[PDB]
């Protein structure tokens, strides 16, 4: 008891400092950044806010409860106040409440007091200049609080932050005018709590009412604030719309646009994983392997944790349907390994041309196939076994009888033996010629050609268009 | 001061991988445990191998008496430093504590290595230290510390010059290149052959002869192979003593394929029971397939398999499934025809592969620059 009682005081001071000065220096600094320059945007505290939010998402967040200085909620949410020279007095009032909190119990517990608190900014009337400061002062307690998952009486409080964000959405439909240099930070912050829309709604069932609401927000941002807005909202669309049918494959067709410019960073890569599974549902394997590889290869630096391992998991699925895959056991991480353990023997069965080896993988690992969600291609891969199996033996064997190859091709009668190779040439597999009497399959090859034209002529536009973009970057980054 | 414990580490490999030896491996382990008075090594061996019965007071009084031999040295260091004689003090405590660390783990070892690092003015004692990191790295199969001691020693050795100990290091780096997969550097650094003679750090000289003659058949060219074994004057006798590998050498040049898999069976059986050769045999075998079949097909562009089947015993339908299944694996790709009786070699791949490295390397090259291009800025 004395140890646990005296170890309570040490923890709070760290949130009492960094959690106090995180939105004070970044948010209060963004106030001066939003007064001037305006360049145009930047607003580097918006990306610094991303660093602080992602910092809280690990440790320590805020609430929950923690029983440490719950008076931080009324601190920033009250006392604009009101015009800038009067706000300076309230900038001293934060220090006044620092002394009040340094004297008495400092209101270490709020809970049901969030009802007057969250409505106090509406009692001030008003900030009135910066809506992102009002939305952030209310959300910063509540957004990390969603990670508690208590599911009692505070879920509707998260919904109240969603209503405050809807007031942020109506103001996202009006002012402008003109260059709402704060709406990019509103795109950032709202995309977060739009994913908190996803989490809080997923506590019970699908959000479908918010699918029409997301389409209302996604379409009302057109065309003005779509920049960096439409990208995050399209992932908010694509993610759960990939979980719930339907039509998103043809919906993103008419939705594009592209939509440029890609922001922010890994956002477009993960979008190419989301739409990567989409474009993989059309089964064209050149665009699917390029969108899946570009999804993972374009994503630094992690941690955390396993979904960046999931894009790598589903990445080589289209490579399994290509007919040739390397053994990936050397790419296993300490985490991704234990997650894909069935998928290991799966791609090992894809390398081999044995049917029973692949079918036993299906019967045993079908439970993990339910966990991943990819099924339909597991039964049709038997056609990849007959095409890779015939690619194997044909190129392999000098002249193979249709009765001897019939074991690995499982039928290979005297009739279909013609089509196996012939319709493989239709798919561009093997050139083997067969004169059918008994018969026997005599595989030869003569090709000397290509390896030339498209690679070098494309490399011209590749390199040139690249260095042109690198011009568009460097030439435009010299403002300082 | 190595081979007794080197055999213990070899006995660890004899216990670990094969599960079918329950008698001789533990017997001679105890025969080597009752000597050198090992403590920490028999703890790891106690968990892997049998838990006895009882050790307890036996090796505890042996570690108590060795502690008296440990405490007579560790209480002599303050009595020796009472006098002054530069080395006439610390050289006794650096070598004997490494013998006291030979009793267990890395502790006295690493702490004496950096201890004496600031004292010895001669490279011979520094290389003896290097020998201690190499033996303790060989027992625990740790390749991290065997690179650093040699990298620091060679600068002092190559400043520089040596005869014997330079050939010793060539055997070391040859054992490290063969510990991981390096085919060329093993035989190239073992080209010294008999000039190393026999040493306690080189263990059995016949085993070293088998190490260089087993690794010289892969990455070395066929004219260079017979130039090493046949033209080599000193290496020819020591490889002649064992007919097992010598039969594989002269029959590989004789091109006869009827003795190959039997001679390779004896070679592979020796490859299985030797340490550090376990990961490398899987590629080593199929490499000997494409090695012997490279001179099989190169005889004639269009070859009649009837002439192949003349003396095989029997190669009529065997080379069909044999070579084919090796072609499907990726070893010696060729297009062969039957009932036309044409084995066509080929395929030079002088067109696709000639220009393929451009687009191939350029794929991942331009990919890796596409990452760094589209990541920044934003």
């Amino acid at each position: 008891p004395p140890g646990g009682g005296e170890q309570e005081p040490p923890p709070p001071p760290a949130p009492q400092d960094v959690e106090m000065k995180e939105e004070a220096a970044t948010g209060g600094g963004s106030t001066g950044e939003a007064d001037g320059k305006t360049a145009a945007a930047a607003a580097e505290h918006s990306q610094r806010e991303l660093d602080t939010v992602t910092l809280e998402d690990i440790k320590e967040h805020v609430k929950q409860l923690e029983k440490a200085v719950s008076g931080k909620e009324p601190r920033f949410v009250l006392r604009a106040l009101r015009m800038l020279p009067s706000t300076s007095r309230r900038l001293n009032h934060y220090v006044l409440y620092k002394a009040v909190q340094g004297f008495f119990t400092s209101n270490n517990a709020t809970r049901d007091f969030l009802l007057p608190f969250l409505e106090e900014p509406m009692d001030t009337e008003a900030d009135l200049q910066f809506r992102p400061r009002t939305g952030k002062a209310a959300s910063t307690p509540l957004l990390p609080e969603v990670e508690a998952y208590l599911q009692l009486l505070v879920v509707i409080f998260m919904m109240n932050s969603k209503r405050y964000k809807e007031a942020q959405k109506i103001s996202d439909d009006l002012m402008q005018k003109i260059s709402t240099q704060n709406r990019r930070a509103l795109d950032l912050v709202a995309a977060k709590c739009y994913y908190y829309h996803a989490r809080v709604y997923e506590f019970l069932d699908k959000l479908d009412v918010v699918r029409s609401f997301l389409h209302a927000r996604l379409r009302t941002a057109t065309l003005r604030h779509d920049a960096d807005g439409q990208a995050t909202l399209l992932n908010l669309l694509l993610r759960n719309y990939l979980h719930y049918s339907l039509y998103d494959q043809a919906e993103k067709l008419v939705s594009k646009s592209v939509f440029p410019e890609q922001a922010n960073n890994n956002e477009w890569a993960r979008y190419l994983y989301y739409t990567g599974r989409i474009k993989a549902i059309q089964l064209e394997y050149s665009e699917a392997r390029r969108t899946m590889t570009n999804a993972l290869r374009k994503a630094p630096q992690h941690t955390a944790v396993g979904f960046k391992q999931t894009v790598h998991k589903l990445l080589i699925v289209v490579e399994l349907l290509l007919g040739e895959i390397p053994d990936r056991l050397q790419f296993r991480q300490p985490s991704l390994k234990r997650s894909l353990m069935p998928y290991f023997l799966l791609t090992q069965a894809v390398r081999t041309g044995n049917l029973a080896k692949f079918n036993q993988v299906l019967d045993q690992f079908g439970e993990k196939f339910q966990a991943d969600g990819t099924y339909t291609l597991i039964i049709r891969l038997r056609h990849n076994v007959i095409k890779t199996g015939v690619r194997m033996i044909s190129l392999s064997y000098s002249r193979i009888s249709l009765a001897d190859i019939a074991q690995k091709l499982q039928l290979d009668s005297p009739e279909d033996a013609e089509f196996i190779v012939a319709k493989a040439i239709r798919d561009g597999v093997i050139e083997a010629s067969i004169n059918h009497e008994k018969g026997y399959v005599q595989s030869k090859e003569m090709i000397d050609i290509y390896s030339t034209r498209e690679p070098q002529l494309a490399f011209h536009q590749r390199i040139s268009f690249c260095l042109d973009i690198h011009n568009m970057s460097v030439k435009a980054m010299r403002f300082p | 001061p190595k081979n007794p414990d080197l055999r213990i580490a070899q006995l660890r490999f004899l216990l670990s991988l094969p599960e079918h030896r329950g008698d001789a491996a533990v017997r001679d382990e105890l025969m080597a445990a009752v000597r050198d008075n090992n403590m920490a090594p028999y703890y790891e061996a106690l968990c892997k191998s049998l838990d006895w019965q009882i050790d307890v007071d036996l090796l505890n009084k042996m570690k108590k008496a060795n502690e008296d031999e440990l405490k007579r040295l560790d209480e002599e260091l303050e009595d020796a430093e009472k006098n002054l004689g530069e080395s006439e003090i610390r050289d006794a405590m650096m070598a004997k504590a490494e013998y006291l660390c030979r009793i267990g783990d890395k502790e006295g070892a690493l702490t004496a290595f950096r201890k004496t690092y600031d004292k010895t003015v001669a490279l011979g004692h520094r290389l003896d230290i290097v020998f201690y990191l190499l033996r303790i790295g060989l027992f625990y199969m740790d390749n991290d510390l065997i690179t650093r001691n040699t990298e620091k020693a060679k600068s002092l050795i190559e400043e520089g010059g040596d005869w014997d100990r330079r050939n010793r290091l060539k055997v070391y780096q040859g054992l490290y290149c063969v510990a991981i997969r390096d085919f060329k550097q093993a035989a190239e650094l073992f080209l010294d052959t008999v000039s190393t003679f026999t040493s306690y750090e080189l263990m059995d000289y016949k085993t070293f002869v088998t190490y260089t003659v087993y690794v010289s058949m892969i990455a070395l060219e066929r004219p260079d192979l017979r130039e090493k074994v046949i033209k080599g004057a000193e290496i020819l006798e020591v490889l002649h003593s064992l007919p097992a590998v010598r039969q594989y050498l002269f029959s590989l040049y004789e091109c006869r394929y009827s003795v190959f898999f039997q001679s390779l069976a004896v070679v592979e059986q020796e490859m299985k029971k030797d340490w550090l050769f376990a990961p490398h045999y899987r590629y080593y075998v199929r490499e000997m397939r494409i090695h012997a079949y490279s001179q099989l097909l190169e005889s004639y562009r269009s070859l009649t398999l009837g002439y192949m089947a003349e003396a095989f015993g029997v190669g009529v339908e065997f080379i069909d499934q044999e070579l084919s299944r090796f072609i499907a694996a990726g070893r010696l790709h060729c297009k062969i025809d039957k009932v036309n009786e044409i084995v066509e070699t080929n395929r030079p791949d002088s067109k696709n592969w000639q220009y393929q490295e451009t687009i191939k390397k350029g794929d991942l090259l331009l990919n890796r620059v596409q990452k760094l291009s589209r990541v920044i800025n934003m």
Partner: peptide, 24 residues
């Protein structure tokens, strides 16, 4: 990051090759 997506969630062969001789 921690932002965006990720926080959501013929043998060798020895015996058989030696046996091919004495098989036939």
């Amino acid at each position: 990051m921690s932002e965006k997506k990720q926080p959501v969630d013929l043998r060798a062969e020895l015996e058989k090759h030696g046996y091919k001789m004495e098989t036939s």
